[PDB]
Amino acid sequence: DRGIQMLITTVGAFAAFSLMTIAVGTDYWLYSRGVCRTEVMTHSGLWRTCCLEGAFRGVCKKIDHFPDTAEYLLRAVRASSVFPILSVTLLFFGGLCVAASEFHRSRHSVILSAGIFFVSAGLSNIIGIIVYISANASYSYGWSFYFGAFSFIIAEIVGVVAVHIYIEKHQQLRA
Amino acid sequence: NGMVGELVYGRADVAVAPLTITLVREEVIDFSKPFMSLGISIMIKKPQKSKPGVFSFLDPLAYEIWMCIVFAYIGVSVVLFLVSRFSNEFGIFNSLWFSLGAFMQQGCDISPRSLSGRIVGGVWWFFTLIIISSYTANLAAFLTVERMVSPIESAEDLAKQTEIAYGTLEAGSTKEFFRRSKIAVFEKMWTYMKSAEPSVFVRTTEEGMIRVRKSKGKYAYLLESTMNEYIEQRKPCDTMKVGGNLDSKGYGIATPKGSALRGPVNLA
Amino acid sequence: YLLESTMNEYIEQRKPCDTMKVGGNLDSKGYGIATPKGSALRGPVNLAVLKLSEQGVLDKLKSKWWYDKGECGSKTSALSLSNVAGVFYILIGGLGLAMLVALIEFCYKSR
Amino acid sequence: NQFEGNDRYEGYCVELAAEIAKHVGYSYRLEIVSDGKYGARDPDTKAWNGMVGELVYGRADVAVAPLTITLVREEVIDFSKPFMSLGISIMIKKPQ
Amino acid sequence: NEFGIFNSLWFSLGAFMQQGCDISPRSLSGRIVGGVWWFFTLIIISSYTANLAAFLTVERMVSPIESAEDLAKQTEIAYGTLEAG
Ligand SMILES: CCCCCCCC/C=C/CCCCCCCC(=O)OC[C@H](O)CO
Ligand SMILES: CCCCCCCC/C=C\CCCCCCCC(=O)OC[C@H](O)CO
Numbered sequence: 113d114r115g116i117q118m119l120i121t122t123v124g125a126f127a128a129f130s131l132m133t134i135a136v137g138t139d140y141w142l143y144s145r146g147v148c149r150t151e152v153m154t155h156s157g158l159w160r161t162c163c164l165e166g167a168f169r170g171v172c173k174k175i176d177h178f179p180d181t182a183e184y185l186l187r188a189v190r191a192s193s194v195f196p197i198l199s200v201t202l203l204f205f206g207g208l209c210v211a212a213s214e215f216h217r218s219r220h221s222v223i224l225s226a227g228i229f230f231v232s233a234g235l236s237n238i239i240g241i242i243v244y245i246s247a248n249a250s251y252s253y254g255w256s257f258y259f260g261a262f263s264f265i266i267a268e269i270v271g272v273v274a275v276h277i278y279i280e281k282h283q284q285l286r287a
Numbered sequence: 288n289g290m291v292g293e294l295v296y297g298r299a300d301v302a303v304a305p306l307t308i309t310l311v312r313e314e315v316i317d318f319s320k321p322f323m324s325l326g327i328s329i330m331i332k333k334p335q336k337s338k339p340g341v342f343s344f345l346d347p348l349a350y351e352i353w354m355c356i357v358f359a360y361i362g363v364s365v366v367l368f369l370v371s372r373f374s375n376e377f378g379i380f381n382s383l384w385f386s387l388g389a390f391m392q393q394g395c396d397i398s399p400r401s402l403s404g405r406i407v408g409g410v411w412w413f414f415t416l417i418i419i420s421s422y423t424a425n426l427a428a429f430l431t432v433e434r435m436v437s438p439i440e441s442a443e444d445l446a447k448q449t450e451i452a453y454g455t456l457e458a459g460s461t462k463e464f465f466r467r468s469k470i471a472v473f474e475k476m477w478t479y480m481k482s483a484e485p486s487v488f489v490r491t492t493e494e495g496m497i498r499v500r501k502s503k504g505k506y507a508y509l510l511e512s513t514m515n516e517y518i519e520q521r522k523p524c525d526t527m528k529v530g531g532n533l534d535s536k537g538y539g540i541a542t543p544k545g546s547a548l549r550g551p552v553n554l555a
Numbered sequence: 556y557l558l559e560s561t562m563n564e565y566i567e568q569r570k571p572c573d574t575m576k577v578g579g580n581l582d583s584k585g586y587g588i589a590t591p592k593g594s595a596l597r598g599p600v601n602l603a604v605l606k607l608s609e610q611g612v613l614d615k616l617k618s619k620w621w622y623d624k625g626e627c628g629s630k631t632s633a634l635s636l637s638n639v640a641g642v643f644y645i646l647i648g649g650l651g652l653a654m655l656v657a658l659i660e661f662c663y664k665s666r
Numbered sequence: 667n668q669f670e671g672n673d674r675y676e677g678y679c680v681e682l683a684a685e686i687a688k689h690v691g692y693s694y695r696l697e698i699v700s701d702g703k704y705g706a707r708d709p710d711t712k713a714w715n716g717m718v719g720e721l722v723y724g725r726a727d728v729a730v731a732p733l734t735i736t737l738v739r740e741e742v743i744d745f746s747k748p749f750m751s752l753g754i755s756i757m758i759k760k761p762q
Numbered sequence: 763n764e765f766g767i768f769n770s771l772w773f774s775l776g777a778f779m780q781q782g783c784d785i786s787p788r789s790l791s792g793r794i795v796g797g798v799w800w801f802f803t804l805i806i807i808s809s810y811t812a813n814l815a816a817f818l819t820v821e822r823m824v825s826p827i828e829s830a831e832d833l834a835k836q837t838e839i840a841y842g843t844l845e846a847g
């Protein structure tokens with residue numbers, strides 16, 4: 113089962129990274145009514161708002177994140193998208209460790225660190241979602257949003273499998 | 288014809304009916320200042336009170352809270368497993384079971400022994416106390432809450448669909464308003480109404496009221512807001528006014544053009 | 556302050572939006588276009604106003620100058636995520652802290 | 667300062683005066699009332715002031731302000747059909 | 763399985779948060795402490811959730827005036843009009 117576990121880990125790590133990178137890049141987080149500015153039905157993301165109806169259909173304008181310390185912090189954290197980006201970064205390093213686990217096998221801790229990166233990536237992702245939704249306060253979420261959500265699920269599955277790999281290693285070599 | 292005809296031809300000296308002030312009429316009779324305001328409005332048969340759904344127990348919390356609770360549940364469970372393996376036992380399946388029991392206020396066979404396991408457990412217990420308390424506060428109220436939902440709830444909505452037929456009183460101000468309109472929605476409405484067979488129009492307000500009442504929510508009557516409000520209050524009150532007013536106007540006391548009563552009536 | 560409802564509404568829609576209309580209207584009336592008694596403009600002005608009213612011009616003007624201004628654009632209800640976000644921040648904070656403590660307790664016991 | 671004449675002003679009544687002028691077919695200059703008052707008959711002097719005064723005494727031909735239709739004014743000037751509805755209302759400071 | 767300081771802290775926390783624990787005191791003095799802490803918990807948590815329910819359902823920010831009559835009856839607030847209007 114070592115092969116299958118590492119396959120799940122590697123494919124999973126790639127899947128999670130891809131989904132999360134697409135999600136951060138693309139602009140189908142939210143379907144609300146609004147204005148792309150040269151109200152109408154729009155599709156927005158982390159960075160841009162874009163129109164789906166009218167003469168300006170496909171025009172896409174940068175979000176003004178800045179139109180109480182708590183409110184300011186929320187606006188800042190939302191504006192930067194630090195948490196979605198940090199999630200992408202940690203998934204990147206997780207996948208890096210997964211790759212490095214094939215070559216330099218001598219140190220077992222590499223695959224564990226992969227695990228910790230993926231688990232942390234998922235926590236960063238949760239915080240991101242909560243900041244996103246909280247800052248937006250009729251609407252609906254689009255496929256970019258759901259890609260972020262599926263990334264969280266896959267990252268947590270891969271974290272669990274990575275940790276299992278390390279456990280199997282430390283339980284094989286001690287005996 | 289009618290009251291305006293009588294005023295023009297000299298059969299009467301004043302009209303003190305709910306006669307709408309309109310441009311076409313103003314050119315042949317002299318109106319007073321309006322003594323009552325109104326607008327065109329939609330009357331529909333009152334929909335049945337919708338019973339709350341099979342999944343009404345979800346209603347006290349927004350969908351996004353439910354989604355986040357689920358991610359939090361997974362997060363907590365994975366971190367518990369991790370910290371415990373770094374420190375029966377907290378493998379992933381038991382971590383999932385422990386977290387679920389904590390959330391549901393049940394408890395289970397096992398409790399964390401490490402410091403990091405107890406930190407995770409402690410904050411999840413705190414989270415649970417806040418969220419479950421909030422959820423359970425008003426729960427029975429959400430389970431038993433009836434909300435009537437209007438089929439159309441707008442003029443645009445009435446124009447877009449074709450399942451519900453809508454008519455007017457003919458030889459009335461509303462018919463004339465729709466006929467001579469240049470607004471997209473009302474032009475569309477008129478194009479429909481003119482062609483519709485059998486005639487969507489009626490001869491009397493009572494006729495339109497009965498038509499809405501007996502059409503099982505397949506007829507929407509376009510009438511003046513004053514009559515609409517009056518009717519909606521009368522028994523059996525199985526009609527309801529939907530949306531806002533399509534425009535603003537008023538009833539005026541009419542007199543024949545060049546009448547000697549024009550000024551005194553205005554001042555009265 | 557006792558003023559006309561139109562002015563009251565317009566004011567309440569603009570910053571510094573610390574004022575508000577209370578209750579209903581004490582009476583019902585309207586603005587008119589005035590002219591000198593015995594003027595020749597009386598009839599045409601009346602007809603012009605009727606034309607403008609029937610053509611939606613007055614409605615559009617009102618909507619433009621009142622609603623679109625919007626300097627400030629501001630019982631079973633579901634809780635919203637914003638109402639409980641703080642509990643989620645504490646939770647994820649706690650998970651972070653737990654992971655940190657676990658790494659320490661490890662490195663300490665590794666040496 | 668960059669503009670001069672009737673084009674110095676904006677607002678609901680400005681556009682309404684424009685549209686009325688279009689329909690009726692006349693040219694006009696928007697003169698602001700000097701008193702800065704709407705209109706009232708001083709019970710002692712029996713003099714109309716403000717816009718109503720300006721209309722009655724012949725200095726102005728139309729008034730396109732938010733001028734309320736009242737009985738006392740209808741006795742001395744002609745009003746058209748109302749172009750906007752309203753009522754007396756109470757304005758209070760919003761509590762925090 | 764014993765009430766050292768860390769398990770004492772864990773026992774108390776679980777009791778308060780309504781979760782229960784691995785362990786329960788067996789001595790008389792341990793049970794006195796546990797029993798009063800259970801009692802304290804029942805009062806305080808019940809008070810929190812009772813009062814929480816109240817905060818989650820209050821929505822009537824009622825204006826002092828709310829009508830003309832209420833403005834006429836009082837005399838603390840002065841009310842005026844525009845001159846020559
Ligand atoms: C061995 C035992 C292990 C112990 C495990 C610990 C977990 C228990 C619960 C933590 C509650 C979290 C604390 C919440 C504090 C929030 C304070 C705050 O935000 O204060 C705002 C202030 O009122 C300005 O407005
Ligand atoms: C079996 C092991 C033993 C466990 C034992 C611990 C349990 C203690 C529980 C509750 C104490 C609450 C008692 C509080 C009652 C005080 C008030 C009262 O009795 O009366 C007030 C006064 O007389 C008129 O004003």
Ligand SMILES: NS(=O)(=O)c1cc2c(cc1Cl)N[C@H]([C@H]1C[C@H]3C=C[C@@H]1C3)NS2(=O)=O
Pocket residue numbers: 308309321324535536537538585605608612613614615617747748749750751
């Ligand atoms: N929307 S509003 O309140 O500015 C408004 C108010 C009114 C309008 C038109 C509008 Cl857009 N027209 C009417 C006029 C049309 C005919 C009926 C009453 C007068 C003559 N006056 S009103 O009823 O005072």
